TrEMBL record, chain A:
Source species, domain of life: Eukaryota
Annotated stretches, region: Disordered: 294-315
Protein name: Uncharacterized protein
Automatic annotation (TrEMBL), chain B:
Cofactor: Zn(2+)
UniProt keyword terms in alphabetical order: Hydrolase, Metal-binding, Metalloprotease, Mitochondrion, Protease, Zinc
GO cellular component: mitochondrion
A GO BP entry: proteolysis
Organism listed in the record: Tetrahymena thermophila (strain SB210)
Domain of life of the source: Eukaryota
PANTHER family tied to this protein: GH01077P, METALLOPROTEASE
InterPro entries: Metalloenz_LuxS/M16 (IPR011249), MPP/UQCRC_Complex (IPR050361), Pept_M16_N (IPR011765), Peptidase_M16_C (IPR007863)
GO MF annotations, alphabetized: metal ion binding; metallopeptidase activity
Subcellular location: Mitochondrion
Signal peptide: none
UniProt name for this protein: Peptidase M16 inactive domain protein
Pfam assignment, any one: Peptidase_M16
TrEMBL record, chain E:
Taxonomic superkingdom: Eukaryota
Name of the protein: Rieske iron-sulfur protein, ubiquinol-cytochrome C reductase iron-sulfur subunit
Lineage: Eukaryota, Sar, Alveolata, Ciliophora, Intramacronucleata
Family: Belongs to the Rieske iron-sulfur protein family.
Coiled coil: none
Automatic annotation (TrEMBL), chain G:
Family: Belongs to the peptidase M16 family.
Residues of the full protein shown: 291 to 482 of 482
Limits of the Peptidase M16 C-terminal domain: 1-112
Name of this protein: M16 family peptidase, putative
Native organism: Tetrahymena thermophila (strain SB210)
Role, per record: Substrate recognition and binding subunit of the essential mitochondrial processing protease (MPP), which cleaves the mitochondrial sequence off newly imported precursors proteins.
Source organism superkingdom: Eukaryota
GO MF term (any one): metal ion binding
A Gene Ontology cellular-component term: mitochondrion
Amino acid sequence: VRLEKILWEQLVNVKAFSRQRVIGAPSKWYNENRTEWFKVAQHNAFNTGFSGVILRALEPLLAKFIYRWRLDIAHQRGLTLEDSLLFMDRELRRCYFFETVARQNLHPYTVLFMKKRRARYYKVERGLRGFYVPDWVRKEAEERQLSETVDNIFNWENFVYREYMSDMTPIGRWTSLSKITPLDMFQYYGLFRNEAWDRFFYNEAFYESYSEKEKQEANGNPFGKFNLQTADGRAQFEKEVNTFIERYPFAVTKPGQKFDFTRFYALEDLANKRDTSKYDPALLESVKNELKQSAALPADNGANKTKKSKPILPDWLQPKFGKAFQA
Amino acid sequence: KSERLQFSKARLTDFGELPQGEIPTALQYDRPCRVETLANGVRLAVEPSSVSPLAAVSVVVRAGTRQETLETSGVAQFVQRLVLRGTSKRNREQIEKELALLGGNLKVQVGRETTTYTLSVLPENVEKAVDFLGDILQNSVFNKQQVEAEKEAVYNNALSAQNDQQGLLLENIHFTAYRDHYFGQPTHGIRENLHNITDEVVKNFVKTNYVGSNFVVAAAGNVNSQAFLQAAEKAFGTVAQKDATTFVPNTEKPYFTPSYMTIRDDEMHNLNVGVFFEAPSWTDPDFFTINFFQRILGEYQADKYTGQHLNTSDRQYSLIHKELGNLPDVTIHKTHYLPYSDTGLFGSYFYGNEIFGNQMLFLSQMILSEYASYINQAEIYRARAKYFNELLAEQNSADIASSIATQVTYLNRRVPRSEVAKRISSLDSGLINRAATRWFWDKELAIVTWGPSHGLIAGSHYNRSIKRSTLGWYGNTHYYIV
Amino acid sequence: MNVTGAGLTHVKDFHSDEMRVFRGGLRHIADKQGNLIYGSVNSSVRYYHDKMSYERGFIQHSRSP
Amino acid sequence: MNVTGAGLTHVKDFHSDEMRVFRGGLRHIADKQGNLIYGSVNSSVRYYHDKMSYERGFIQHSRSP
Amino acid sequence: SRPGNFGDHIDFKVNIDNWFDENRVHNEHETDIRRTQIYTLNAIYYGGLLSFAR
Amino acid sequence: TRDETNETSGSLLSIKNTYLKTVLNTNETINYGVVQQSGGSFEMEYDQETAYFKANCLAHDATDVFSMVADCALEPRSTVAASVGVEKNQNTHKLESYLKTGELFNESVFKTAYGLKGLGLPLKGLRGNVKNLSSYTLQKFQLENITPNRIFVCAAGVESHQEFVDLVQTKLAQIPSAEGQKTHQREKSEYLGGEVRNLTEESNVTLALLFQSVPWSSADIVAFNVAAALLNNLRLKKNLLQKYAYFDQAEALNFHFTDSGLFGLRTSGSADRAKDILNHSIAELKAIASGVNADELLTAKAALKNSVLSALERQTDRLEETVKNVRTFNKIQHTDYVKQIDSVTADQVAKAVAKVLTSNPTFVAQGSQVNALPTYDAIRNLLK
Amino acid sequence: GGEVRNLTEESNVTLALLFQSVPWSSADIVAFNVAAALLNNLRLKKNLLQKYAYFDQAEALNFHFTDSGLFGLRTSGSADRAKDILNHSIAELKAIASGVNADELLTAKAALKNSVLSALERQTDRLEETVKNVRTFNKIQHTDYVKQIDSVTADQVAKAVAKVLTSNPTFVAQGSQVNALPTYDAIRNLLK
Ligand SMILES: CCCCCCCCCCCCCCCCCC(=O)OC[C@H](COP(=O)([O-])OCC(O)COP(=O)([O-])OC[C@@H](COC(=O)CCCCCCCCCCCCCCCCC)OC(=O)CCCCCCCCCCCCCCCCC)OC(=O)CCCCCCCCCCCCCCCCC
Ligand SMILES: CCCCCCCCCCCCCCCCCC(=O)OC[C@H](COP(=O)([O-])OCC(O)COP(=O)([O-])OC[C@@H](COC(=O)CCCCCCCCCCCCCCCCC)OC(=O)CCCCCCCCCCCCCCCCC)OC(=O)CCCCCCCCCCCCCCCCC
Ligand SMILES: CCCCCCCCCCCCCCCCCC(=O)OC[C@H](COP(=O)([O-])OCC[N+](C)(C)C)OC(=O)CCCCCCCCCCCCCCCCC
């Protein structure tokens, strides 16, 4: 029996209902990046419609009980949100996919520092419970803002998708565990999956996706539709950014300082085609230098190198000193 | 033209594939081919190709090893070499010069049911080749001294036959499959009898076998049909007509003899195993269906296919390639379909490390028998496309000429590309299952294993395990283990 | 010495493909790779048939019942 | 071909000393020769504790209780 | 059809009996009928055993 | 391989071993399944100065197969592809060393001829650099080498040129033009006549003697091809293998490049009496310089015509050599190879070989008794 | 006088140049030992290892046989400068043929005496050399090794090395770029 051409498919998947299967050029499984999908979904849910209106009203509670709670716990542990979000403790401890990807792509320090940061706290917490990280460690924990953790998270997720998740083809499968238990014995993977039945071929065109309009809209201003050129728009934008900074202490600035909006406007002007000399040349130079440095991947200098070992056998494993004429 | 765009996908109205009856547009066209018969019975077929740069002439004579006896075994090997040695018109030096001038691309294939002589030359001298080819095979003079000289060469060839391991294993499966018929004896002949051949034996063989009714001359490439036909008639009009009074040995059906042979040799590092079923003759109704089965099984290499390019062996549409990729050391696998006038053999030959002996022993049957119960449409379409491409891939003049000659000899007709495509494309999963159960399900086997047999000695006899291998899901017990 | 054998002896060493999933990149190891470890009962049960037998030039014929 | 790999592929092969008593002549193989097959649970029960852990230039100090 | 590297047959008398040829019913044609007969005999034996098991 | 440096040597081998692995548009699994279910074939090969991908399929599958081929050829290599390629390259190196294949010997011959740089760079890549074939090195190699002006696209069996032009436009038109931008370019090749003598305790000795013959642009390429055909088909067998029982195998090697060339002999025989093998090979090579007879020339030309036209008859090989001719010379020269072969005369071949003999010999020897061989000056004097 | 040139793709190139020395019977053997002591202790370190960094290691080989002998140098250094490793090495050996300074000769003889007497002080090595002396010279000569070393002069060492250099060279090279080295005739001409 063929799943396609089955009676249900013949009766339902017909041109009359626009449910016909359409065959196009071959394309990879997992065609949609998860990070982009979540970006668009978040924008649609928060900044549009009745759902957006409801979720905007809940910004205080969500910020208090989902962001500052995690941040407070991490700071108590001498950690940041990165330590809990860039690589989940589940992946850090036991995950073979993460282990293989890290071994094949990542430098050891990228995860060694993550592990040692938690080792700092848990060498004391397990010995004596209730450990509160002292101020000096908490300071270095607080130094890093969320604006860099988000960059790391997006970089890692995009790399994982473009390199590994984009080169995977799932298949129908039986129980992974070779367990004699009958309940595990007859586990069937492949049915009850939406992806399994949505497309029966690798040539089928994709029937559900985000429209280009939504994708472009999700890349606009997260805070709202403003006009930074007019003074009225800038005032509202600054008000919203100030309340955001208040809600999230270590998101973009230290919890005691204020955000520099002139530098942000200079960055926006430089990035887009709009330009002018309303900013000081020093400001423009500083902004350009900061932009260059932020996008610069660190490289090795090849300096201050330690000495490599060339071990030799000890003296007792070598012949004695004397050497006379053999004959 | 169907439409403006050659690369259109409109006709693919079945989920990206053509429907059951339809065929690709490229295969809807057939090159011209004219077949004629002469008074002597020699059949001339021409399939010209003006654009091609070469012309190939293939002469197929239905004489073969089948027409030999124990007291005259190996006379075909002497015949093939002696024909070039000399002729009444031309000495050895003269024919050697003539062969060199038009290129050394002369291939002599001494088969069991027939012998083929294929010569590929330039278009401007193709006629000359015919004049040569007709003479060399017709007026050859077999001297005693020449036979004495060639005895050593024939004996060395017989001894060296072991160099081509696949060929020697094919000869072994022929020997084991037909034990009560001379058709089982090796093509190179019995070694100890090679020195017993005389000039008179060769002369009698050629006189009683090279008859007008046994000659088919096929031509392909840049060849002028009229000129080639006229020249071939002039050349081959002097061949003696077949005589009924003459006696042709071994004219009865070589009934298939199931068996299991084991050439145990523990100093080879590798094992050559072959498992074959009785297969239809060239005229059986299930001929192109079994060719489709051959395409389904296909061939495998350890440096290609699932053994080299995939994340996992499961991600493909060839069932046998999955298993072969799962086995690191099973290196070579090829499905051979050899049809003859009376009988035929369809089977699989594996070559690989002896540690996977049983895996190579029980695999070929398991897949084939499984097709008797269920075959996925993906495999059907894969084999369909492969057969289409191979049909469109016959371009070399020598290969096409040899195929034309063989088709004429076994059918007295040139089967066109379109007809073959229509025949194979009409196959369905149900038809595939019915053919497989007719020919493969619960059927007898001819098995040969050559090489280190320390693992296989225990089951070296035709027993229950071998008996149930030709079943489907019942009998895979031994394959999976190890 | 830093060499594997320490510069004093040769060690018959092997890195079993068991306990590994990928031989390279995301590609999987052969399903029956472990069978390439010769002379180990753990590799296969067929190794329990460990009778002594060596022969050359021997041909055997068995006919179907 | 008559080559170990058939002349067109490379085989990761190894003749385990398990099921063999003598290295040569009349001397037994080392008792713990089988441990030289890395990455196999059959070699040792210590392979169950196999969480990822890599370090260079790391020193730790511990004191007697 | 033996390998070339094989020589002449060794003087050792490997076979004392010729049962390979003697033990034959010359029915190369119609082999499937004999196979069905063997299957039927096996079926009878298994049926008796299964009756006892029942 | 000529365009690779020591850092990225062997990148072409990794691409070949993982030529089906792409991630941007289609997956390795899917692009393997496309070839499998299309009934056609897809293959890659690479020479010192070329890298050719070729796929043959049915007309209705043409678009998908072309998209797959373009993605495989032009898409940057991924990290997973890099790892798989490293593993496969290690396996390939082990196999080549184990089998003692003739390619492993030709690698030493090229290294001697041109040095570790340029043409001498091994096709399989340096063995010590295999671990360094990460995605970064492969991508750098592609960026510095793969440019729109260095890409050619070929089709055969196409009803209308414009349709295939549009198909290629939909895929390769994006690649921004590299004209006016700093290109890697190729440094001119230099020929050095060094010698290599390897002791290996081998029962057989293999020798090779090659000389700088001519590039593609020259008019003697046909002459050197005819000379190689005469050696292989007629002279080497008759005068070297048949007469002497210690000659295992002799064959004439002839390679031509955009700016250099190498023509010579490679003969393998018994380890002992290697001096006799060397002297006989030198004498046979010098025989052509002495002269060529009319009958021998006609036989060699007939064999060469047969081989070339057999290659040209098949559509795939004809298309491949059409692409190579177009990329070497703007015109197509494979439609009149017969005329050029006929134009060759014995005097021209003799003069070409005699002129080539005067060059610095490239002499490579492997075997048990390579040490007991004439010195380089002695070999030059013998050739002189 | 054969030559061997093996391409090994080693980051380091190892060269060895040897000539036929005298057998045990000849009295020059002691002189040759002094020559070795003139290289492995004093010269070869200063002239090659100290001045040039690409010289991984250089040493002087001196083997004696009942009917023949071997004497020369074995050097190893950076492959990219293989030629520079060769030329200089030859010069060092050739320098010995040019002459030996009094101070260098005294230092080499003192070092050779120290090594030989350190070997002889141990009873096992003394017994082994006693057996070898009896089997070679039919008498015991290790009792007067010091006198033989003292009797050596710079002129004898220079003449012996000059005579040895005239013999057909034996040249071996294993490295990444051994394919580019002076031809055997060029090697002989440089040695000449
Ligand atoms: C205490 C006093 C009574 C003792 C009774 C002992 C048994 C008597 C009968 C058999 C006598 C011969 C024994 C030969 C053993 C050979 C194999 C062996 O030793 O391998 C090591 C074996 C483990 O094998 P393994 O390969 O590692 O597989 C498990 C993995 O860990 C994989 O783990 P996993 O997580 O994937 O799987 C979880 C779990 C999930 O399992 C389940 O959910 C399945 C339920 C359990 C099995 C049910 C079996 C029912 C048998 C009914 C028999 C009726 C009476 C008649 C008996 C005569 C024959 C008909 O899997 C298992 O537990 C499977 C292991 C089965 C162990 C029992 C094997 C022997 C019985 C096999 C059938 C009869 C063989 C006869 C041979 C001789 C000829 C007569 O360990 C044991 O045998 C454990 C013994 C524990 C003894 C404690 C008492 C339990 C007794 C058995 C279960 C009874 C359940 C209640 C039945 C009620 C019926 C109404
Ligand atoms: C009338 C015939 C009755 C026959 C009874 C037979 C009983 C034996 C069991 C048969 C199977 C039962 C149904 C299983 C449903 C599993 C759903 C599922 O996959 O989860 C989706 C869902 C997640 O969905 P998702 O987020 O889209 O994720 C999809 C995954 O990616 C997807 O991940 P994946 O693809 O990796 O999936 C892995 C795994 C799925 O994941 C699991 O491990 C599932 C675990 C489920 C545990 C709870 C099971 C409770 C089952 C109760 C079913 C109702 C029984 C009513 C009986 C009435 C009296 C007869 O797959 C399986 O193991 C599925 C194997 C099932 C094969 C059989 C399918 C049904 C065939 C029915 C027709 C048979 C005709 C005869 C044929 C004879 C031979 C030719 O998981 C859940 O939250 C579990 C939902 C469980 C629902 C239970 C039923 C609720 C409604 C009850 C209504 C009232 C009934 C009457 C009451 C009494 C009135 C008086
Ligand atoms: C409680 C009330 C329930 C309602 C009543 C239903 C009763 C009917 C029960 C049907 C299920 C039991 C299976 C029987 C048939 C299975 C056939 C099969 O497996 O074939 C494929 C299997 C395949 O197994 P295979 O792979 O071993 O076969 C391969 C063999 N070669 C290669 C030679 C082809 O076997 C067959 O091919 C057999 C085909 C014959 C089909 C027999 C059908 C019988 C009809 C059954 C019931 C019909 C409905 C009427 C019932 C009355 C109800 C009112």
